[PDB]
């Protein structure tokens, strides 16, 4: 791809998300999602193999169906309110359809069935864009319509997201599918606290984006797409062996790392509202995520080490990859729990 065309298309992705964030009119919300989808499709087809075309097709179909359901929600709101302000909705039918459409856009379960496939088919940088930047616009719309969101619906989608994103990561050796099921679990955590305190939603979204970008930046820096290929990193770049894995200890949510901060603040703000069963069971399923991701940590900085001979040739070459913000993102994703009351800046 021509780098000018790449810059213009990435600015169009960013512009679509900014248009969703700043606009007060529902048609401009729908326009921002259309522009965001249209612009992100060539980022996925950047390498032109059949897997990226299949992934772009499945992503197009799911996001297109979600855009149509979003416009049907907007149209029902115009029926029952005669106006277009992006605020609460004035029909439970419009609220239900817009919550379903945004859950399809996030890949929350049971609309999760595209995220591991699409994340598998596309490269690591476009997978990073899809799992970090594309979450921002539907979480903004869910932030603005929360006087209308049905409680039982959003809690059902959140627990089904956390359970399916947990039980998806057992059978996986592909790193992109692991990050996709981690995405499904974390979006369930974010929408669990949405109707109680959406500042903790924004805290979980920011910490998740930092940890996800650290993991995808390390996967790009090591040229590893599978567990089996990630396990050759100790003989090639030994500082990458610890950074990937203590960032991955952050991502499951485990103290004293900063990925324990969002889940702890979510449990904290849901027990103010006299919900005790629900954060307990959601964090038990997060321990199931810890179970599988700790097995991956064992496989990379423990048992299955063995190397090949052509590592002897890779030893004579240093990295030229621009590991952009990787020490910054790695320090932010691990040592930020002593600065936990910084979360008031998101209020």
């Amino acid at each position: 791809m021509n780098p000018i065309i790449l810059i213009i298309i990435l600015m169009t992705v960013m512009l679509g998300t900014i248009i969703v964030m700043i606009s007060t009119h529902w048609l401009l919300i729908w326009i921002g999602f259309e522009m965001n989808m249209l612009a992100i499709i060539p980022i996925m087809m950047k390498k032109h193999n059949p897997r990226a075309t299949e992934a772009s097709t499945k992503y197009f179909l799911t996001q297109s169906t979600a855009s149509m359901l979003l416009m049907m929600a907007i149209i029902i709101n115009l029926m029952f309110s005669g106006q277009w302000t992006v605020m609460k909705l004035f029909n439970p039918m419009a609220s239900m359809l817009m919550t379903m459409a945004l859950a399809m856009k996030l890949g929350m379960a049971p609309f999760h069935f595209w995220v591991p496939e699409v994340t598998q088919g596309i490269p690591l940088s476009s997978g990073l864009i899809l799992l970090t930047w594309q979450k921002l616009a539907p979480m903004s719309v869910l932030y603005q319509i929360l006087p209308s969101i049905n409680l039982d619906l959003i809690l059902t989608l959140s627990i089904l997201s956390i359970t399916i994103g947990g039980w998806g990561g057992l059978n996986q050796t592909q790193l992109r599918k692991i990050m996709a099921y981690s995405s499904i679990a974390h979006m369930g955590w974010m929408t669990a606290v949405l109707l109680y305190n959406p500042t903790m939603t924004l805290l979980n979204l920011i910490i998740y984006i930092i940890m996800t970008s650290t993991m995808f930046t390390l996967f790009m820096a090591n040229s590893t797409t599978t567990t089996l290929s990630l396990s050759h990193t100790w003989n090639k770049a030994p500082i990458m062996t610890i950074l990937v894995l203590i960032t991955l200890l952050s991502m499951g949510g485990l103290p004293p790392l900063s990925g324990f901060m969002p889940k702890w603040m979510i449990i904290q703000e849901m027990t103010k509202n006299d919900s005790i069963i629900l954060p307990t069971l959601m964090a038990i399923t997060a321990l199931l995520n810890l179970y599988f991701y700790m097995r991956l940590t064992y496989s990379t900085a423990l048992t299955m080490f063995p190397s090949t001979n052509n590592m002897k040739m890779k030893w004579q070459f240093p990295t030229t990859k621009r590991m952009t913000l990787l020490p910054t993102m790695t320090v932010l994703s691990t040592m930020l729990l002593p600065l936990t009351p910084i979360l008031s800046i998101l209020e």
């Binding site: 900014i18 700043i22 606009s23 007060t24 309110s81 106006q83 277009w84 302000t85 903004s140």
Partner: protein
């Protein structure tokens, strides 16, 4: 995150299409201009939580202007009672409802 860039920069990007009672081309009102204006001037600035229960009457008037459910229900009641009184026979239509009286203007 609602980053209110339009109110920060003092530009209008999409507030003009937002409501029916806004400034329209050639000063055309909507069908429910007054009802939406009354609902907006009731619910302004008090917050949505107070607005759902303190401005419920203006909103019911405005929704019933928009959809006309009570009016269609009342017209169906009158017209079905009229059909019953025609078929039973205790009513006959006047000349101004059969088209026989050469209208006012």
């Amino acid at each position: 995150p609602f980053f209110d860039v339009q109110k920060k920069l003092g530009v209008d990007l999409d507030h003009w299409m937002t409501i029916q009672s806004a400034e329209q081309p050639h000063r055309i009102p909507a069908r429910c201009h007054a009802f939406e204006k009354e609902w907006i001037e009731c619910a302004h600035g008090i917050g949505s939580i107070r607005a759902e229960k303190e401005c419920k009457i203006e909103f019911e008037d405005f929704r019933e202007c928009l959809l006309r459910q009570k009016t269609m229900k009342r017209l169906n009641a009158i017209k079905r009672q009229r059909d019953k009184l025609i078929k039973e026979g205790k009513y006959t239509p006047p000349p101004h409802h059969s088209g026989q009286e050469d209208l006012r203007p």
